């Protein structure tokens, strides 16, 4: 906790005015890379994107991270298998068969799951997850103003992650994918401890 004080750090952050790619759905799943971290954004008019997948060797040779989620509770499992080739969620309208194989896993984190942002980090032994929700009320590019994402779960896992994909549902969508880089940042903390302003020193 910090209050009414400025602080600086050299951790992973998304550079300001970076060339963040815009990916619209007719599914657009080329299995984007994952160097050290990615910035995910979702602003569609529904909840079609309700999952994430992480891993390095997804051809059933190395453990992978699943962030499968629905409208009730998240299903985070760390197992080693290829789903079929790539995720495909076809939802009485209640079905879930994106993967046709199972193996020996190590995690069953099922604690808890109109613009929503997600920042993932792959530190040595804790897959960090950050989330935040802010209204938009307009139809344009990413709005102005700062919005600091708060930590959600530590997810203690030691699996390497170099590729990630987006889980989409069906019977149109869009999402923003970014990449973090290590550079010095300046953070401003208010009296309540919330980050309001930030300056990218580079």
């Amino acid at each position: 906790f910090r209050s009414s004080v400025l602080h600086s750090t050299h951790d992973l952050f998304l550079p300001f005015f970076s060339n963040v790619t815009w990916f619209h759905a007719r599914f657009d799943n080329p299995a984007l890379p994952f160097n050290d971290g990615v910035y995910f954004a979702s602003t569609e008019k529904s909840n079609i994107i309700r999952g994430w997948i992480f891993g390095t060797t997804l051809d059933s040779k190395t453990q992978s991270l699943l962030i499968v989620n629905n409208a009730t509770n998240v299903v985070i499992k760390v197992c080693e298998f290829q789903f079929c080739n790539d995720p495909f969620l076809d939802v009485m309208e209640s079905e879930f068969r994106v993967y046709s194989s199972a193996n020996n896993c190590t995690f069953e984190y099922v604690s808890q799951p109109n613009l929503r942002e997600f920042v993932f980090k792959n530190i040595d032994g804790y897959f960090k997850i950050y989330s935040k929700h802010t209204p938009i009320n307009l139809e344009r590019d990413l709005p102005q103003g700062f919005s600091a994402l708060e930590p959600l779960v530590d997810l203690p896992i030691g699996i390497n992650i170099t590729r990630f994909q987006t889980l989409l549902a069906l019977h149109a969508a869009a999402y923003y994918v970014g990449y973090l880089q290590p550079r010095t940042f300046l953070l401003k903390y208010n009296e309540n401890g919330t980050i309001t302003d930030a300056v990218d020193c580079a």
């Binding site: 906790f1 910090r2 708060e150 401890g193």
Partner: protein, 217 residues
């Protein structure tokens, strides 16, 4: 010990209102300011415990053996005529309302003295009250005078010191000198500074006293 945070101090209930995802905080100096109890979710502030140097008030061994102690920056309730001032807790001297000249500087306008015998504490007296009778047409003209001689002492120089760097560091050892020669010209810079100070003392002594070219008898 809060989930691994090791320290020692005073825990006190505070209202800093930490956010749900954070449980401990730090000040601008990266010093732990508060930590939240992981059991009852209570947030409490951590304050370092009182510390301060003890300054003994000695009126002189040749006069009396009675002494007073001063715990700087602490409260008297955390440490005999105990007295609390802005400089700390004063023990061994009673506070008097009479003001005198500051003999032993204690702090925050308070000074101690050995008067009729016990050590007493009092506020500093800046001087005697003097109300000049100012008026539209009042002038004061002296009718006499006094010739006063005031002594003023000023240092002119100090001891000219010269230190043998190799002999001080090694002391007649060659194996030590072989390693000393690796560090560089430190022994040369120090010798140069010492010689500069030595010639500077003589220059000062020359500039102060030798201001005439003839020795008048």
């Amino acid at each position: 010990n809060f989930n691994g945070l090791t320290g020692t101090g005073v825990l006190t209930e505070s209202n800093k209102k930490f956010l749900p995802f954070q449980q401990f905080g730090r000040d601008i100096a990266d010093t732990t300011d508060a930590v939240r109890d992981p059991q009852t979710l209570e947030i409490l502030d951590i304050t370092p415990c009182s510390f301060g140097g003890v300054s003994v008030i000695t009126p002189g061994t040749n006069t009396s053996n009675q002494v007073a102690v001063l715990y700087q920056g602490v409260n008297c309730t955390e440490v005999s005529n105990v007295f609390q001032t802005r400089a700390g807790c004063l023990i061994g001297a009673e506070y008097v309302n009479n003001s005198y000249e500051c003999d032993i500087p204690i702090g925050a306008g308070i000074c101690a003295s050995y008067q009729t015998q016990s050590i007493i504490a009092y506020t500093m007296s800046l001087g005697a009250e003097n109300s000049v009778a100012y008026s539209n047409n009042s002038i004061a003209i002296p009718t006499n005078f006094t010739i006063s001689v005031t002594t003023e002492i000023l240092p002119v120089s100090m001891t000219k010191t010269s230190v043998d760097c190799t002999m001080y560091i090694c002391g007649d050892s060659t194996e030590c000198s072989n390693l000393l020669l690796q560090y560089g010209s430190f022994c040369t810079q120090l010798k140069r500074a010492l010689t500069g100070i030595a010639v500077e003392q003589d220059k000062n002594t020359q500039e102060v006293f030798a201001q005439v070219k003839q020795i008048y008898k």
